[PDB]
Structure formats: C-alpha cells, structure tokens
Amino acid sequence: ADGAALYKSCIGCHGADGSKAAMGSAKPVKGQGAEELYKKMKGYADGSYGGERKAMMTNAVKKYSDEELKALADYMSKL
Amino acid sequence: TIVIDHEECIGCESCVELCPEVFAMIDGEEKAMVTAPDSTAECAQDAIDACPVEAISKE
Ligand code: HEC
Ligand code: SF4
C-alpha cells in the first residue's frame, strides 16, 4: 500500500489502481486481493504467469525488485 | 515517422519495450525519450492504445 505514489510510471496503462489495463488488448485483472496479485506479479518475472503484453510487468517486478510490489499493488484489495 | 502528434505520456514506459531504443527507457513522466522518431516500427502502433490522446500517428 503506497500505490499511486510510485505508480507514476504506470498511469498510462492503468489509471491509478489497476483500473484499466491498456497496452492495447491486455487483461484488467482487478477485483483482486493483494496476495494473489503479488503471486501473479512475481509469476510474470519467473515465467510462471504471463499476460498478452506482460513484459513491461516483468520489467516493473524486476526494477521494483520483485518486494516493492507489496508497496505498489498490494493495495488493490478494494477491488 | 513516429508522429507523436503532440507528445504526452502519463508514464507508461510501454513503447520502449516494443521499439527497444527507438523509444529509449527514459520516460519523463510526460515525455518518453523517443530517440529515433523516424522509425515506423509497427510495435509502436500498438502503443497508440496507451497514449492518452492516442497521439502516435505513423507516416
Ligand atoms: C504499461 C506498459 C505498464 C506498466 C509500466 C505497468 N503495467 Fe501493470 N499491467 C500492464 C498490462 C499490459 C497488464 C495486463 C497483462 C497483459 O499483459 O495482458 C498489467 C497488469 C497489471 C495488474 C493485474 C494483476 C496481475 O496480472 O498481476 C496489476 C495489479 C498491475 N499491472 C500493476 C502495475 C503496477 C503496480 C505498476 C506500476 C509500477 C504497473 N502495473 C506497471 C501494463 C503496465
Ligand atoms: S505508450 Fe504513449 S503515453 Fe505511453 S510512454 Fe509511450 S509515447 Fe508515452
């Protein structure tokens, strides 16, 4: 939980809280809980989950190294 | 030409990983560093649907 504050990079794909995915065709996985997101997001880096675009999420997990997602996306347990 | 018809970003860093140093991975939270705006690299034609004004024309 921090989200928006370090989400400045990601706004164009999402809005503020996973609220779109816009890549082009991308899966707006929202209606979620932090734990599942963290697993999915770690999954993106380890090739254990993927998405249609999903290499930017791999880079995000890498550069916000793949504990900062608990700051970022572990928030989204609202939807 | 990547005619970023006006530039805007709202982040995304998205199109860099499509056109790898054609946009280079400096996003300047309104800007992305479009190093090579000549290159109609068709991966960036996806990233029209991640510009907030859909503001990539190509030519
Ligand atoms: C723009 C190119 C992206 C950046 C940078 C970030 N995200 Fe993203 N995210 C993007 C896409 C295309 C997708 C959908 C998957 C696909 O490839 O089809 C996603 C998905 C998520 C999700 C959904 C849940 C999940 O699958 O883990 C979340 C919660 C999410 N993204 C969060 C998020 C955060 C915290 C980022 C800022 C650091 C971020 N994304 C960057 C595209 C983009
Ligand atoms: S997809 Fe568009 S708004 Fe997003 S970083 Fe690239 S040029 Fe900017």
UniProtKB/Swiss-Prot annotation, chain A:
GO molecular function: electron transfer activity; heme binding; metal ion binding
The keyword Metal-binding belongs to this UniProt entry's keyword annotation: yes
GO cellular component entries: periplasmic space
Binding positions for heme c per the UniProt entry: C10, C13, H14, M57
Post-translational events: Binds 1 heme c group covalently per subunit.
Superkingdom of source: Bacteria
Keyword hit for Phosphoprotein: no
Main location group: periplasm
Alphabetical keyword list: Electron transport, Heme, Iron, Metal-binding, Periplasm, Signal, Transport
Localization of this protein: Periplasm
Function statement: Natural electron acceptor for a formate dehydrogenase.
Designated name of the protein: Cytochrome c-553
Curated annotation (Swiss-Prot), chain B:
SUPFAM superfamilies attached to this UniProt entry: 4Fe-4S ferredoxins
Record's keyword terms, sorted: 4Fe-4S, Electron transport, Iron, Iron-sulfur, Metal-binding, Transport
A GO term for molecular function: 4 iron, 4 sulfur cluster binding
Swiss-Prot/TrEMBL cofactor(s): [4Fe-4S] cluster
KW Iron (keyword) present: yes
Pfam families: Fer4_13 (PF13370)
Cross-referenced InterPro entries: 3Fe4S_ferredoxin, 4Fe4S_Fe-S-bd, 4Fe4S_Fe_S_CS, Fe-S_cluster_ET
Sequence positions that bind [4Fe-4S] cluster: C9, C12, C15, C51
Presence of keyword Protein biosynthesis: no
Organism superkingdom: Bacteria
PANTHER family xref list: FERREDOXIN
Protein name per Swiss-Prot or TrEMBL: Ferredoxin-1
Organism (species): Desulfomicrobium norvegicum (strain DSM 1741 / NCIMB 8310)
